[PDB]
Design a protein around this ligand. Structure first.
Ligand SMILES: Nc1ncnc2c1ncn2[C@@H]1O[C@H](CSCC[C@H](N)C(=O)O)[C@@H](O)[C@H]1O
Ligand SMILES: Nc1ncnc2c1ncn2[C@@H]1O[C@H](CSCC[C@H](N)C(=O)O)[C@@H](O)[C@H]1O
Ligand SMILES: C[C@@H](C(=O)C(=O)O)c1ccccc1
Ligand SMILES: C[C@@H](C(=O)C(=O)O)c1ccccc1
Ligand SMILES: O=C(O)[C@H](O)Cc1ccccc1
Ligand SMILES: O=C(O)[C@H](O)Cc1ccccc1
Ligand SMILES: [Ca+2]
Ligand SMILES: [Ca+2]
Ligand SMILES: [Ca+2]
Ligand SMILES: [Ca+2]
Ligand SMILES: [Ca+2]
Ligand SMILES: [Ca+2]
Ligand SMILES: [Ca+2]
Ligand SMILES: [Ca+2]
Ligand SMILES: [Ca+2]
Ligand SMILES: [Ca+2]
Ligand SMILES: [Ca+2]
Ligand SMILES: [Ca+2]
Ligand SMILES: [Ca+2]
Ligand SMILES: [Ca+2]
Ligand SMILES: [Fe+3]
Ligand SMILES: [Fe+3]
Lengths: 333, 332
């Protein structure tokens, strides 16, 4: 390449950083929904309506425009050639930046081994939760509902491992009005958020929550309710069960603690293999590099496939997700 | 086409991690190792610097995802954009390690209701580490060209926003007799600069004082200002703004430094009309960053238009290559 080509490529990498951050912010502030409905927007009007500092609002749209996501026309912003694609994956940009940005920013301090004890990185939990709701819905739901449609029975008590916001249990209780639900989450803040949200939607008597580590599910006290659970779900946290030996034992413990579970629906993103560096798709690099930074194991799809029998489960159906890196839903029994 | 859009959006995502990795790779030693040898071994690098190797691999994968380096097994090689990205490594460091929190917290920083008190956070030590190389890499040519055209030998020099003290030191090395005086608003700045200066043996020659250069009249160091025959102010001048404040600050500086012959003022400025898809490195970060921080940023013609009211005359102006649109003015 020429020096001019390198110059353009490096300027684009710099601007991409600002656009990337802006995709999450623009989602969250309501701009991308406006642009997807009407195809355009007036930046002063948008700034007044949402009581935002207009000079910053101009930067945000400029940052998006600098890489072809939107176009600026006088007072107006219109959707650019990459709008649909960036909008589709906006929760992933949110996750990377608003949720995870401080991890990546602190690369020089996170990488040194002597630094890597106790609290050594900081995520924004609320922001991660904010993004995870759309990540679940947008990428996981169709496979999730296809698995639910093919259960071959009607659930009476469902337990969700890593229940977070409580939304999955709420949706299951809408599909199956008899159903009792039980969410396990390790984070007491998620427990508080979930109990609150469930109560406001009218489900406080049907759905309840317990703080607990699903890696040590054999220690969770939930008034003997686990024995009545006949459906188990776990989405977007199963990599936490790994390394392999930890995972085998966690699966057996799940198997013994939920002895009346018929189907166990397990959904997660996985570590890819042999994608060429210049062909990496959205998410993949951030998912893998981030967990490598945090010290968290990420299995491949073949590692999952290979653990289940030893774990006490049989995989009877598998669904490919489009495309949140390489992600899947397993139907286990 | 849907495929192009997919590739482009993936590139934007990956560029975020590469961007952050440039600064990190600088800081950690990897960029200089690649400069020397053109290549390096990942395991070796990790072991030498005692780094968690899975993360080190992701760092390089990040740089590789967009062409800065190329991976060949366990080896990393300089890539097509290595020279350009290394050249600008301090601007990535500034964008990410320095100012990343500001940009991450965009959703919280834009609402007016939240814009009171300390409503954004910068990493001051990181900013200072990037600004030190920014000074030397982008402003040195024009700064020294201005020094060469002074037409006198300075006896006492003052530097506003002296930071690390490096400018004073370098002046001292070029004009052995000279005395230096630095003024910085932050005690962090005063501390390092004072240590640095002693370590280098310039302790009698160069001293410092905490002070706000916007209100230079209330700086009770006073004594030596009258001696100063050269004033310098680099990468903070936009702090004097908005306009009316800048007029006052310039007049105050004129009157607090009456024997100053030349005043060398260098800074980056707000550009005008650059089309969005042709924005060069830094511009957008600098401008959008100052807009989120609520700080005024003048264009070059605002600066041109303020010196006379401010009590100075611009005798020579130097364009900079290219830190957005940057400039050094020679005022008297
Ligand atoms: N070992 C563990 N045991 C229980 N909960 C866990 C856990 N590790 C992570 N979590 C929880 O798992 C959640 C992952 S965020 C995704 C949540 C949810 N399954 C959904 O699809 O929306 C967080 O709430 C976190 O607190
Ligand atoms: N109003 C003000 N008065 C004095 N110093 C200021 C200031 N606003 C910012 N600064 C200082 O300006 C410096 C900016 S960065 C370092 C610039 C230095 N002139 C150089 O070329 O290397 C910081 O040390 C900061 O404390
Ligand atoms: C929730 C998140 C994750 O692993 C993390 O934030 O550590 C995640 C998991 C799976 C797909 C997308 C994001
Ligand atoms: C010091 C920095 C700046 O204004 C900031 O960090 O807010 C700066 C000024 C001018 C050129 C580059 C960086
Ligand atoms: O081994 C697999 O591919 C999956 O883990 C589950 C599966 C196995 C056999 C038939 C269907 C699904
Ligand atoms: O107005 C300008 O362009 C500069 O601020 C200073 C200058 C003016 C005239 C001749 C040289 C320099
Ligand atoms: Ca409009
Ligand atoms: Ca365009
Ligand atoms: Ca840092
Ligand atoms: Ca920390
Ligand atoms: Ca029912
Ligand atoms: Ca129980
Ligand atoms: Ca059974
Ligand atoms: Ca792609
Ligand atoms: Ca397989
Ligand atoms: Ca080698
Ligand atoms: Ca390449
Ligand atoms: Ca935020
Ligand atoms: Ca003062
Ligand atoms: Ca360019
Ligand atoms: Fe994770
Ligand atoms: Fe500034």
């Amino acid at each position: 390449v020429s020096e001019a080509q390198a110059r353009r490529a490096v300027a684009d990498i710099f601007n991409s950083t600002l656009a990337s951050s802006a995709i999450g912010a623009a989602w969250e502030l309501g701009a991308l929904d406006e642009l997807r409905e009407n195809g355009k927007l007036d930046v002063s009007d948008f700034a007044v309506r949402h009581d935002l500092h207009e000079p910053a609002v101009v930067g945000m749209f400029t940052a998006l425009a600098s890489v072809g996501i939107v176009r600026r026309e006088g007072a107006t912003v219109v959707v650019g050639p990459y709008f649909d694609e960036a909008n589709h994956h906006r929760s992933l940009f949110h996750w990377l930046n608003q949720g995870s940005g401080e991890l990546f920013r602190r690369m020089p301090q996170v990488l040194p081994n002597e630094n890597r004890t106790g609290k050594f990185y900081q995520l924004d939990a609320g922001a991660i939760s904010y993004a995870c709701r759309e990540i679940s819905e947008r990428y996981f739901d169709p496979a999730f509902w296809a698995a639910v449609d093919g259960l071959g029975y009607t659930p009476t008590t469902v337990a969700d491992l890593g229940s977070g916001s409580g939304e999955r249990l709420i949706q299951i209780a809408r599909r199956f009005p008899g159903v009792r639900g039980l969410g396990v989450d390790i984070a007491d803040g998620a427990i508080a958020m979930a109990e609150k949200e469930v109560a406001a939607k009218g489900f406080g008597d049907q759905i309840s929550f317990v703080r607990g580590d699903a890696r040590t599910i054999d220690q969770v006290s939930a008034r003997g309710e686990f024995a009545e659970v006949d459906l188990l779900t776990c989405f977007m946290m199963g990599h936490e069960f790994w390394p392999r030996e930890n995972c085998v034992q966690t699966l057996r413990k799940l198997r013994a603690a939920f002895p009346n579970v018929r189907r166990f629906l397990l959904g997660d993103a996985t570590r890819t293999v042999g994608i060429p560096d210049r062909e990496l798709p959205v998410f993949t690099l951030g998912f893998e590099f981030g967990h490598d930074m945090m010290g968290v194991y990420l299995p491949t799809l073949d590692e999952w496939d290979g653990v289940f029998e030893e774990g006490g489960w049989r995989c009877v159906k598998k669904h490919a997700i489009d495309s949140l890196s390489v992600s899947v839903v397993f139907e286990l029994e």
